[PDB]
Design an enzyme around this catalytic site. Structure first.
Site, short mmCIF file in Angstrom:
data_model
loop_
_atom_site.label_atom_id
_atom_site.label_comp_id
_atom_site.label_asym_id
_atom_site.label_seq_id
_atom_site.Cartn_x
_atom_site.Cartn_y
_atom_site.Cartn_z
N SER A 151 1.25 -1.27 -0.15
CA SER A 151 0.19 0.45 0.00
C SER A 151 0.91 0.81 -0.44
CB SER A 151 -0.86 0.36 0.94
OG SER A 151 -1.73 0.81 1.94
N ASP A 316 -10.08 -5.65 -3.86
CA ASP A 316 -9.36 -4.73 -3.43
C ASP A 316 -9.47 -3.33 -4.01
OD1 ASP A 316 -7.78 -1.59 -2.17
OD2 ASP A 316 -5.18 -2.92 -2.38
N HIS A 349 -8.67 -4.94 0.56
CA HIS A 349 -6.91 -3.81 0.76
C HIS A 349 -5.94 -4.73 1.84
CE1 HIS A 349 -3.71 -0.90 -0.15
NE2 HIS A 349 -3.93 -0.97 1.27
#
Lengths: 368, 369
Positions: A151, A316, A349
């Site tokens: 991320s 995600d 995510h």
């Protein structure tokens, strides 16, 4: 097994051309630096994380680092082979955690004896990779066998690969992106606005005793949700015994549904040692991101020479799969040895934090 | 070419056991109600919508009602064949728009001479259909040829079909859902928090000229993005010369990227005639939604007899593909005549508000059989 460290710079120029005096960031590392300093793998951490990518600081810690499942002896990021090192970013979200060392709006300005607040200079992903460069240099390290991150940490990693192409041999982007596109920059703003509206925020000058707790909790609730999936919420919804027609939110406009009260409590408990302004600064840091921080994504990908491995989560909803696919296909079009593999679990995510092991072989094969 | 009308109920019981007096909602209709009153097609409107499904109030209105492309003479929803009626929700978000007529927090409580604020009772989608039902009954209608609506409008639509089976011969759900599941309920809660954080909100007791404007804009920004897609934002950013390292937000924490400035102004613009408290109430009415309003969707589906058409947008991020699929599949397992076609466009949720016409024929053939 893990010792928290601290790296200090008396002077540091931000990417936006500002000065931060007396930078201090925490860091830690696992494994052994070999003689050539040629087995260095940098873990670059995600939006709310810290340097604690694996291991524990105290036996009694309820849990190890977030990537412990792929960092350690004989693991896909093998600490018997690599000196694996990770660095707290500036404006670290967990500013009041006793293990996190950071420089940011909470740091005291010697010049007022009060926290910088929104007097702190805008920081960027590059500023993080540049603090990491200085730490590495001060440890005699001139090359990275790999940089790996999920991320916000995949932004650092791919930036490294782009900004310092001779420094990175391998780039693993996990639940990641090559840029914050206009969609992502907009989405991340919504994490920031709840804190701007909290009356305690006082344009960032609040004391610790009168901090904007509600706006921070409100941001985390939005973050927590963006990072998951309908599946995850509907399953925990089931555990709570969620219903559409609950008597409390039906009878009182000021009560909330079971699932909301859960998310509120969770985010409140997750934000105890966090700081509102630091959330604001990491938001802005992500919004400013592009691999290489040059004009656009194509220019930044043209600089990469590291082989690249991209691991999007298929579910995600925050850094969506097309992000990884964009960077990956842009790279192969440039004859970059680029590989894309997918994480496809139910946490969205957070597949790439909590269950990166699902793709541990791909990481491992990439790292042989 | 479209006259806005008012419906009044001296006294209204809400689903939550409370009373509202002087219930006033706006409505309009297109087409001619046949002698049998058997050609009635009710349009139920989405979160920020109103009754203005088609046509114009003034020919110099900039844009016609949001479904003019499929509602009208000779269109898929043929207003020379059908009578097409639509009513403003309670707590309508457009609380200060001159065409909407609604009842909610900004209404004056006749007991106190002052606004309701958050003394207004909690409203639900059931309360919306019941005000519609009351209007339809006031007009002598006993049965709906079709109830159609996108999003929150489809919540009303499938609710109409589950709470009053014989009333509803056909139900068309657009970009909608059978229920607000935990995911969607939490998701709309984020719409509500920024309003409530704003200091001016004052636990709901602000004057119109002391409203929580920055909180309201915050909510609208989120809503606007939730209704759209990356493609739209990325095309938009490209129209905006969006770059990632823009000098304005890089030099100044208080500045913003191009896309955010665009998003903010569009929300402050969308919010001019909106009331904040009304937003809180529509959010809660959506979180309380399950078709039928029983303890679950299965129970709400079990009583639906209307043949059903579902038109989700594949790229929807607000009410994603699966909510329509979950309802369409439940109904088919109940041997309910249920069809499902998809909108493929890239406007996400708003495919079903501004580009329904892509499935005009599926809707036309579902209505004309």
């Amino acid at each position: 097994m893990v010792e928290k460290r601290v790296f200090e710079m008396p002077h540091f120029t931000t990417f936006g051309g500002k000065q931060i005096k007396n930078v201090k960031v925490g860091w830690e590392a696992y494994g052994t630096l070999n003689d050539a300093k040629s087995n260095v793998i940098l873990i670059t951490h995600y939006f709310s994380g810290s340097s604690h990518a694996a291991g524990k600081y105290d036996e009694n810690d309820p849990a190890p680092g977030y990537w412990d499942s792929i960092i350690g002896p004989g693991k896909a990021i093998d600490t018997d082979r690599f000196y694996v090192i990770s660095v707290d970013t500036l404006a670290n979200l967990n500013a009041y955690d006793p293990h996190v060392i950071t420089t940011g709006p909470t740091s005291i300005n010697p010049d007022t004896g009060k926290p910088y607040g929104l007097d702190f200079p805008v920081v960027t992903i590059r500023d993080f990779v540049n603090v990491q460069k200085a730490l590495l240099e001060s440890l005699g390290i001139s090359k990275l066998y790999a940089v790996i991150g999920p991320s916000m940490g995949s932004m650092q990693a791919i930036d490294w690969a782009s900004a310092y192409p001779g420094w990175v041999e391998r780039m693993i982007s996990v639940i990641g992106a090559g840029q914050s596109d206009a969609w992502t920059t907009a989405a991340l703003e919504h994490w920031a606005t709840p804190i701007t509206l909290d009356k305690n925020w006082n344009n960032g000058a609040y004391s610790k005793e009168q901090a904007p707790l509600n706006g921070l909790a409100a941001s985390l609730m939005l973050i927590t949700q963006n990072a998951l999936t309908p599946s995850f919420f509907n399953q925990t919804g089931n555990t709570l015994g969620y219903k559409n027609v609950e008597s409390a939110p039906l009878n009182d406009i000021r009560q909330s549904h079971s699932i909301v009260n859960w998310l509120r409590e969770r985010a409140k408990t997750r934000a105890k040692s966090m700081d509102a302004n630091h959330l604001l600064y990491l938001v802005r840091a992500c919004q400013l991101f592009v691999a290489g921080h040059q004009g656009n994504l194509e220019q930044g990908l043209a600089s990469i020479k590291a082989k690249t491995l991209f691991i999007p989560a298929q579910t995600d909803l925050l850094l969506m799969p097309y992000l990884s696919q964009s960077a990956h296909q842009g790279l192969t079009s440039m004859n970059n040895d680029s590989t894309l593999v997918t994480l496809n679990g139910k946490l969205g995510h957070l597949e790439g934090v909590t269950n990166v092991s699902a793709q541990a072989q791909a990481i491992r094969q990439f790292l042989e």
